[PDB]
Homo-oligomer: A and B are copies of this chain.
Amino acid sequence: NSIQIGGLFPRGADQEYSAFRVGMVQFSTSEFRLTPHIDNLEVANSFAVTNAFCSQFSRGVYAIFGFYDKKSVNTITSFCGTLHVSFITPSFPTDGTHPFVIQMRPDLKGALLSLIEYYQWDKFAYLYDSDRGLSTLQAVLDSAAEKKWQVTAINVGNINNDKKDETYRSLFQDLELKKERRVILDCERDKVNDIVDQVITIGKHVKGYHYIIANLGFTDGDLLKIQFGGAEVSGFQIVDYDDSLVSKFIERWSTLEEKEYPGAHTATIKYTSALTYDAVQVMTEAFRNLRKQRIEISRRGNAGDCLANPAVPWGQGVEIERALKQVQVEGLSGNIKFDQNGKRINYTINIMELKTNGPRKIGYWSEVDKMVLTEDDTSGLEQKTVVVTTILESPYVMMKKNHEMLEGNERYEGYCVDLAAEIAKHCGFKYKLTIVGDGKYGARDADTKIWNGMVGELVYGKADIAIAPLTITLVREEVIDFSKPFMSLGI
């Protein structure tokens, strides 16, 4: 059953169309086949989109797969909600709940709010691009008003190429006025690779700055530039290379010839092409389940004018979309589930931070569960709170009256407490205030030389340092060492 479908592709989406051609024969043909009529046409001109849509409707296909632009989403929704034709896309998700649209891209906005609340920022700048839409820009301002954030948002998208070396300099020098430190970028990969190069030219990737990329292919762009910088860069992945089917597709994809499939003979892949690959799995599962329920999709006639007055559609497409919303398979993004509208739920997004060796993950974020870090504590050097032994003596070391409500190093008070604070301030170490067990100053045992008290805590490797009323003798220099004396006294 070679079923007629329609395909919309931009002039330049070569990796995505190549991935579609791969997924065409990656798994098919025990059954129905597909008849893809491909339209390598533009996406900006909605008149061209209209011409292509009426041409594929004159073909009279059952499903249309492709992309759209923000100058075209109204056109696609307005025609599909009329003519009841199911439309499937990997582009940015729509704003209103629209019928007959299945959209392959998960949300980013809740993840990004989770990330900001994890890093605990208060004031930052937000470079956005207009041509991807403004849904995230609308979303962040609400939580900025509620969570008392200070947002300086700046449009950057409409700047021409021919002044695109000094516009950015003027922009970041204006950011120098408030002395900005925290930047969230929201662009396409080309604008990312332009702006990173201009930042690395003007020298703003030292230790001190911090960057968040708001995309899905965090490692799909260039990161060898600012890998060794000093700044810290975090982002998001939906394609995780550690998994079995993922690495299988990596090996299969790397072994292909670049001349047959352009942009395919690499190691990594674009997330757009990954969702394009998973779309074929969903679209084949659909007709699989319709032959499982044995419901015929016989058009039984021709299609006609898309300007039919009034046009009347056919509700077996409603049943097609109904079975589309029930598909649940595993793919490159992981599990998939749909809502009552065609939006994706049941996804998982990895949080990816750049380090010196390269990118790595620190945690995940679910559709309902918040940011769950994976406890990747590779911190091999922790400055240990050193062992400080003492004994209770007024006014050297005294208890406070509210010691149960307070905690630890706050509980003790006196001359020695103040002094140990001064020593730790000058020497930069961490410390924890402890008490000797046996409550003595300490002397040696007869015939066994067992130094008890605070002496054996330092002799026997138990305690680390002792700021305490201890007297320099002759018999104590042989086992421990003293500094210069700080307070004189006598019997």
* Cβ–Cβ contact A79 & B47, under 8 A: yes
Q: Is the CB of B154 within 8 A of A142?
A: yes
The answer to whether A153 touches B141 (Cβ under 8 A) is yes
Q: For window 127-144 of chain A, which residues contact chain B by CB distance below 8 Å?
A: 130, 134, 138, 141-142, 144
- B residues near A75, Cβ cutoff 8 Å: 46, 50, 74-75
> Do A169 and B228 touch (CB < 8 A)?
yes
Query: Is A174 a contact partner of B146 (Cβ separation < 8 A)?
Result: yes
Q: Assuming the A-B contacts A75-B46, A75-B74, A206-B203, are A155 and B174 also in contact, with contact meaning beta carbons closer than 8 angstroms in the complex?
A: no
A72 within 8 A of B: yes
What B residues does A130 contact at CB under 8 A?
Answer: 138
The listed residue with most B CB atoms (<10 A of its CB), out of A46, A72, A229, A309, is A46
A47 close to B78 (CB less than 8 A): yes
| B-contact bits for A39-56, CB 8 A (1 contact / 0 none) | 000000111001100110
Q: Is the CB of A201 within 8 A of B228?
A: yes
CB-based contact B174/A145 at 8 Å: yes
Interface size in chain A (residues, C-beta < 8 A): 45
Does A82 have its Cβ within 8 Å of any Cβ on chain B?
Answer: yes
- Tell me, yes or no, whether A307 is within 8 Å of chain B by CB: yes
Q: Is A299 an interface residue (CB 8 A)?
A: no
In A50-80, the 8 Å CB interface with B consists of 50-51, 54-55, 71-72, 74-75, 78-79
A–B Cβ pairs within 8 angstroms, 24 of them: A45-B78, A45-B82, A46-B74, A46-B78, A47-B82, A50-B78, A51-B309, A55-B309, A72-B74, A141-B154, A142-B155, A144-B152, A145-B152, A145-B153, A146-B174, A148-B178, A169-B228, A202-B228, A203-B203, A203-B205, A203-B206, A203-B228, A203-B230, A206-B206
Measured CB to CB, the residues of A under 8 A from B are 45-47, 50-51, 54-55, 71-72, 74-75, 78-79, 81-82, 130, 134, 138, 141-142, 144-146, 148, 150, 152-155, 169, 174, 177-178, 200-203, 205-206, 225, 228-230, 307, 309
Q: Enumerate the 10 nearest inter-chain pairs by beta-carbon distance, A residue then B residue, closest first.
A: A46-B78, A47-B78, A71-B74, A145-B152, A47-B82, A203-B206, A203-B229, A46-B74, A141-B153, A46-B75
